[PDB]
Amino acid sequence: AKRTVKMGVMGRYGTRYGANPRKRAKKLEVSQHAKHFCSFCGKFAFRRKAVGIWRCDGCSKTVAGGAYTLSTPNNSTVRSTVRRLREL
Amino acid sequence: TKFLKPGKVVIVTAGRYAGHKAVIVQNSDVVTKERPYGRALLAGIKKYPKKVVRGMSKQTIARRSQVGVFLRVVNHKHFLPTRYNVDMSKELRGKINVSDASKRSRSKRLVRHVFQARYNAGSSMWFFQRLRF
Amino acid sequence: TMMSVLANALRTIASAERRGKRQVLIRPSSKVVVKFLQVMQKHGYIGEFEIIDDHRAGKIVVNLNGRLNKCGAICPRFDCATTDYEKWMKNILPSRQFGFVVLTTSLGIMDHEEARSRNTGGKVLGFFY
Amino acid sequence: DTINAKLQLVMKSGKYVLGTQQALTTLRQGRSKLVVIANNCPPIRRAEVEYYCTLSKTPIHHYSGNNLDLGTACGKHFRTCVLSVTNVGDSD
Amino acid sequence: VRMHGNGRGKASSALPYRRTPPAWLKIASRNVVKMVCKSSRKGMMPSQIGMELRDSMGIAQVKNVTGRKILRILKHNGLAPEIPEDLYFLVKRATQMRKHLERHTTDRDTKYRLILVESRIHRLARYYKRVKQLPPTWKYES
RNA sequence: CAUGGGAUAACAAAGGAGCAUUUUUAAAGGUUAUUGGAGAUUAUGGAGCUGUGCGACAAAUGCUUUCCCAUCUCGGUGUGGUUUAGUCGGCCUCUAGGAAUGAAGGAGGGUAGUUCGGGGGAGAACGUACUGGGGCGUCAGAGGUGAAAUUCUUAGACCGCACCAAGACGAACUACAGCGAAGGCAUUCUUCAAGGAUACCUUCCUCAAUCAAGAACCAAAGUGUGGAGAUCGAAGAUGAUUAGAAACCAUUGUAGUCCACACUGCAAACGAUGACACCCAUGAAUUGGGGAUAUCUUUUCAGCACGUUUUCUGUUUUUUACGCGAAAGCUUUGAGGUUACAGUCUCAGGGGGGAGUACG
RNA sequence: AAAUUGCCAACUCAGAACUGCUUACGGCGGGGAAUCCAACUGUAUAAUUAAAACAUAGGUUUGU
RNA sequence: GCACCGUCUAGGUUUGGGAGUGUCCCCCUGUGGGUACCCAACCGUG
Ligand SMILES: [K+]
Ligand SMILES: [K+]
Ligand SMILES: [Mg+2]
Ligand SMILES: [Mg+2]
Ligand SMILES: [Mg+2]
Ligand SMILES: [Mg+2]
Ligand SMILES: [Mg+2]
Ligand SMILES: [Mg+2]
Ligand SMILES: [Mg+2]
Ligand SMILES: [Mg+2]
Ligand SMILES: [Mg+2]
Ligand SMILES: [Mg+2]
Ligand SMILES: [Mg+2]
Ligand SMILES: [Mg+2]
Ligand SMILES: [Mg+2]
Ligand code: NA
C-alpha cells in the first residue's frame, strides 16, 4: 500500500524543514538517486557516485555529468552547437 | 564464405599462447563428442626469431634466427583469423599428424624446419613479426 | 451517423412533396422502406417506384403524384395494442376520415385500418396522409 | 525503414541468431547471409565483427538505432548488439 | 478522416458492378494463389500484395478471380500476419511518434496526435479481442 | 402462467482451414433373455469395435486433376453473329483443400503525387527598426504639447555617416486567403515526426455516433525557480490640465513583457449558434487535389510551370428561392425541412435580485 | 495423492478448563484547554544568568 | 649601386627529363615477394 500521500523520499525529514524547501529538494533527490539511461550499452543503469560523477552498472563506464541529473539541458544545447560548428 | 582455409594466418587470443601467430593446417568445423566445438589444428610461432643487426657473428645470428613452434588443436573462439597466409602444400599438410606422441613430435620438427626455411627465404615476413601489445 | 433508414427515406419523400418535385431518389433502400412504399402506393399516395440494384444498399426512385401531404416515421417504434389505434389516430393523424398509421405486425407491414380488421397489434412505423 | 521490414520478415519466416558470440560462430561457418550491427556497439567489437564479415564476404548493415532499438525491431524484450540472419526466409 | 478529426474526405475506390474477370485475363486461379502466397512470403502486407497484382498483372480483384480474399488466402496457407495489418500500422505509427517525442518534449502537436492514435488503438484492440483475432488479455503498451 | 403469430427488435454464439456421405454384403480377430424355477459354471451366438474386401447411390466445386523430374467450308440460329475447319505428345514421386452475402457516397489501414499548408518541434543564418554605445563631423539648442513644463543640452544634446551590442519582432506583399481540436500559427535554409484533402477495380468487414465518472491540451493576466531585460509599461514619482484629478496628455518608472521548467485552468476561450447523419433554389468567385481539351515562358529540383474552357471531391466564403423567426435576421455555411410537433447522443435554463454569496 | 512412512531440535503465540489475589520485588510517561517568544536538531557566560541570546537551513545586498 | 654573410625543407599545384618490369615464382584462382623516379618553378613554413 501507499505509505505517504504527498511527500515521498522526503518523509525521512518528519515535519521539520518546511513544505517548499522539501518540495524543491525532493525533485533533485529523486533525480540524483534514479537510474539514468546509458547511451553506451543501452541500459538504465547510470547511478551517481558523488556530485557530477555517474557510473553505469552495466558497462562500468564513468561519466562527468550534472550535479543531480546525468545530463543538463545546457549540456545538450552545447553538444548540438559543437556538432553543428564541426559540420560547418 | 568459408575463409578458415588451411594456410590462413591466425592470432591466438586465449591461453598461454595468446597473441602468438599461428597457421591453420587442418580445419574442423564438425563437432564430435570428444571436441564439441569448431576447431583447427594450428602450427604456431612459440618463439619468434629475434632482431639481428649488422655486426654480429654468424653464430649469434643463427642463434637469434631460430624459430620455435607449437602444434595444438584450438577452439575457433580462441583465435582471430587474419588475411595473411602461409602456403601449406597438400603433401606438407598430409604429413603433419597429431595422432600419437611420436607422430606429434615428428610433426613439430617438420613444422619447425618448414617455418625456418620460410623465414630464410624472406617470405611471409609479417607472419614472423611478433605482435606488440 | 445515419441511425434509421426508414426515417431518412420518409423525410426525403416529405421534402420532395413539399417542394412539388415529380420524382425523388431514396438512398439507402431497405425491405422496410419498400414495404412502406408499397403501403402508400396501395392507397394511391405515390405512383410507380423503381428499385435500382448496385450490389449494396440499393436506391429507389419514387414517382410522386401530388397527393401526399406529409409522410413521416415515428421513432422509437412504440408498441401498439389493438385498443391503442384510436389513441394514435388522435395524436398523429389530421382527421378520422383520412390518413394512415403504418404498423409492423407479425402479419406484416400494414396500415392501421387493415391491422384493426385483422385484430392484430404491433409497433408503429410511421404515418402518411 | 526498409531494414525494419526486412528484419520483421526474417523474424517471421527466416532463421536468425542474436548476440555477438553466436554471430561470430555463424560467421566462422559459412552460414551467415547478413549481419546487422547497432550503432551502440563497442568500437572494438564492431571492428572485429566487420573484419569477420570482410573475410567471409558477408554483407554488413549498420543499423541506425542502438542495441535497444535493434532488440525492439526484432520483436525482442532485450537488447542485441549484433544480429546474424542464417536464412533470409524469402526476405531478400 | 472522420474518427479523431474534422476531416470529411470522400476519397475511396468504387468497386464495379460487374464482378466477372475480363476475358483477356488468362491467369488461372491457382497461379494467382501462388502469386499472393509468394508475395506474402516476400514480405508484403495484404494491401501491398493487391496493389502489386493490380498494377502489374492486371488482376483488379483477387477475390473476383480466385473467389477468396487476399487475407483469406494467407490464412489458409498460415501466412496471415500475427497482429492484424491495420493494427500493426497504427502501432508502428504510435511507436514512431513516441520515438520522436522522446527527443522533442515540446512537440505538443505530436503529443496530441499520439493521444488520438492510442485512443484509436484501444478501440481497434477491443474489437479484435471481441472478435478473437487477438488473444484475451492483449494490451497495448506505451 | 398457457397458447397462437414472426414483421420489427433484443439476448447468446461465431469470426469462417479456428473446418466434418449413405447403403448392400460377406468373411478375420477380441455384468441380457431362453434352456421347468432358483444357486454356480460353460460355451454358443446377437449387437456393437477395428481392420480386409464387396455391391448400389450420392456429393457446394473437375483428381480421366494439380504440381514436381525427365524424352521429345460444315451444321444450327436470326434476317449477321455462333463452335469448328480450310486460308505437341509418351513416361517418373505427391495431392485435403476453391465455395466464402456484399464491400455502406459508415469506420479503420495501405500506396502515390518524395502532393498541400503563417500546422507542430529542433537548429542555424538573415533583415531593417527601436534603444544604448563609442568613431568621424557640427555647434546651440533638442525633446514634448491645445500651449507648456517635468526631461536632456557647450560637459556638445539634437542632427548626419559608417559601424557595433543586446533583446524583441518579422513591415510593405497581408486578402470576407491558408493551416490547426481549440488556444493559436507569418524572414530564409536544413532537419524530425506528423495531419488533411485528392487519386485508387489496394486491404478489412461494423470495428461505429455521442457521452455521467474519469483524463489531456488551453490567450492574456497571475504564481514558483532559473535566465533575459532592447522596447513598452500595472504600482510609484514628477510635470501639466482641473473647484477638486489619487485619471485621461507629457517625461519616467517597478513588477511584468521575452526564454526554460513547473503551477494556475477564472476570457465577449463568440459564430454569444454542442456533436454526428440526410434533403435543400440561384450567380459570380476563392484555396488544395484530380479528369478532359486557347495563351505565355521554356538551358535545368523540368517529358516543366503557369494560364484558358468544362467537370469533379474536399475547404474558408459572398450576392441575390422556399421556408423559419417576436423582429433584427438565418438560409445547401440554417436559425429551414416542428402543433402536419418523433434520425441519434449529450450539456444547460425555468421572473428579477440576494448571489455564484454563506456553510461544508 | 512420497498429498506417504519413520525418526528427531528449539523456542514462541494463541485458545480452553480448573483454581487463586492482601492487587503485593525491582524498573517504568501524569494528562488536558490556551497565551507570549524562538521555526526545528544544535551552541553558550569552567565557579550565581541555558534563555526569548548565538548558530541555523532559507532571503537579500556589496566588492571582485 | 655590385657583391659576401646567406642555406636546407614536409606537403600542395605543376614544368622539363625517364626507366626499371602492370611483374617474379608459385602450386586458373588464390598466395608470397618485390616497383611505380629525378629535376625545375610557384604556394607553404618546419
Ligand atoms: K465499407
Ligand atoms: K536549555
Ligand atoms: Mg467520436
Ligand atoms: Mg559627438
Ligand atoms: Mg515578410
Ligand atoms: Mg504571461
Ligand atoms: Mg515569470
Ligand atoms: Mg535565489
Ligand atoms: Mg518610455
Ligand atoms: Mg465561464
Ligand atoms: Mg458561450
Ligand atoms: Mg488548402
Ligand atoms: Mg447562401
Ligand atoms: Mg529555540
Ligand atoms: Mg539531538
Ligand atoms: Na533562542
Residue C96 in grid coordinates: 378520422
A21 strand G contact, CB < 7 Å: yes
Q: Do the strands C49-52 and A44-48 form a parallel or antiparallel pair, or are they unpaired?
A: unpaired
Q: Residue C113 and residue B70: Cα distance in Å, rounded? A: 114
- What are the CA-CA distances from residue D62 to residues B57, D59, D76 (Å)? 56, 10, 19
Do C63 and C37 reside in the same domain of the chain? yes
Q: Residue E118 and residue E104: Cα distance in Å, rounded? A: 19
- CB within 8 Å of A72: residues ≥ 6 apart: A65, A66
Do C54 and C92 reside in the same domain of the chain? no
Do C63 and C76 reside in the same domain of the chain? no
Q: Are C13 and C69 in contact (CB under 8 A)?
A: no
Q: Is omega for the bond preceding C76 within 30 degrees of 0, making it cis? A: yes
Q: Residue C124 and residue E34: Cα distance in Å, rounded? A: 55
Q: Residue C79 and residue C104: Cα distance in Å, rounded? A: 9
Do C31 and C44 reside in the same domain of the chain? yes
- What is the signed CA dihedral for E89, E95, E99, E102, rounded to 10 degrees? 140
Domain end call among C68, C98, C117: C68
Do C60 and C86 reside in the same domain of the chain? no
**Domain membership of residue C104 as a residue range:** 69-129
Do C27 and C13 reside in the same domain of the chain? yes
- State whether residue D91 sits within 8 Å of chain E by CB: yes
Sheet holding C49-52, edge to edge: C23-26, C59-63, C49-52
Do C6 and C63 reside in the same domain of the chain? yes
Q: Are C100 and C43 in contact (CB under 8 A)?
A: yes
B37 strand H contact, CB < 7 Å: no
Domain end call among C68, C84, C119: C68
Do C28 and C91 reside in the same domain of the chain? no
- We report the CATH number of the domain holding residue C61 as 3.30.1370.30
Indicate the angle between helix axes E85-103 and E108-130, nearest 10 degrees.
Answer: 150
What pairs with residue B9 in β-bridges? B23
Residue E19 in grid coordinates: 464482378
**Interchain pair B80, D32: CB under 8 A:** no
Q: Are A59 and A38 in contact (CB under 8 A)?
A: yes
Nucleotides of strand F lying closer than 7 angstroms to a protein CB: 4-9, 14-18, 66-67, 97-100, 102-111, 119-124, 180-182, 192-209, 216-218, 260-261, 276-280, 313-315, 322, 336-338, 340-344
- Tell me, in Å, the resolution of the deposited structure: 2.7
Q: How was this structure determined?
A: cryo-EM
Place of cell 440494384: C53
Q: Do the strands D15-18 and D82-87 form a parallel or antiparallel pair, or are they unpaired?
A: antiparallel
Do C64 and C79 reside in the same domain of the chain? no
Q: Are D58 and D27 in contact (CB under 8 A)?
A: yes
Q: Are D68 and D39 in contact (CB under 8 A)?
A: no
- We report the CATH number of the domain holding residue C100 as 3.30.1490.10
Q: Are D40 and A42 in contact (CB under 8 A)?
A: yes
DSSP string, E10-79: -------S--SPPTT----HHHHHHHHHHHHHTT--HHHHHHHIIIII--S-HHHHHSS-HHHHHHHTT-
Q: Find which nucleotide's C1' atom is closest to E76's CA.
A: F17
Q: 3-state SS of B9-37? A: EEEECCCCCCCCEEEEEEEECCCCCCCCC
Helix (H) or strand (E) holding A48: strand A44-48
Q: Residue C13 and residue C35: Cα distance in Å, rounded? A: 15
Question: In terms of residues, how long is chain E?
Answer: 142
Helix and strand totals (H; E) in chain A: 2, 4
| Nearest of B66, B77, B95 to residue B6 by alpha carbon | B95
Q: Residue B69 and residue B114: Cα distance in Å, rounded? A: 10
On chain E, the residues whose CB falls within 8 A of the CB of C52 are: none
Distance from CA of A17 to the nearest CA of D (A): 42
Domain end call among C25, C43, C68: C68
C–E interface: beta-carbon pairs under 8 A? 3
Q: Are C13 and C62 in contact (CB under 8 A)?
A: yes
Do C6 and C64 reside in the same domain of the chain? yes
**Interchain pair A40, D40: CB under 8 A:** yes
Do C124 and C76 reside in the same domain of the chain? yes
DSSP string, E94-116: HHHHHHHHHH-TT-HHHHHHHHH
Name the residue among E38, E43, E82 with its Cβ closest to that of D9: E43
Which letter, b or e, does each residue of B76-113 get, where b requires 16 or more Cβ atoms within 10 Å of its Cβ? bebbebbebbbebeeebeeebeeeeeeeeeebbebbbe
Do C46 and C76 reside in the same domain of the chain? no
DSSP string, chain B: -----TTEEEEE-SSTTTT-EEEEEEEE-S--SSS-S-EEEEEEEEEPPPP--TT--HHHHHHHT--EEEEEEEEGGGEEEEEEE----HHHHHH---SSHHHHHHHHHHHHHHHHHHHHTT-STTTTSPPP-
- CB within 8 Å of B77: residues ≥ 6 apart: B14, B37, B38, D21, D24, D25
Residue A36 in grid coordinates: 539514468
**Interchain pair D5, E41: CB under 8 A:** no
Q: How many separate domains does chain C show?
A: 2
Residue B131 in grid coordinates: 605482435
Q: Are A70 and A46 in contact (CB under 8 A)?
A: yes
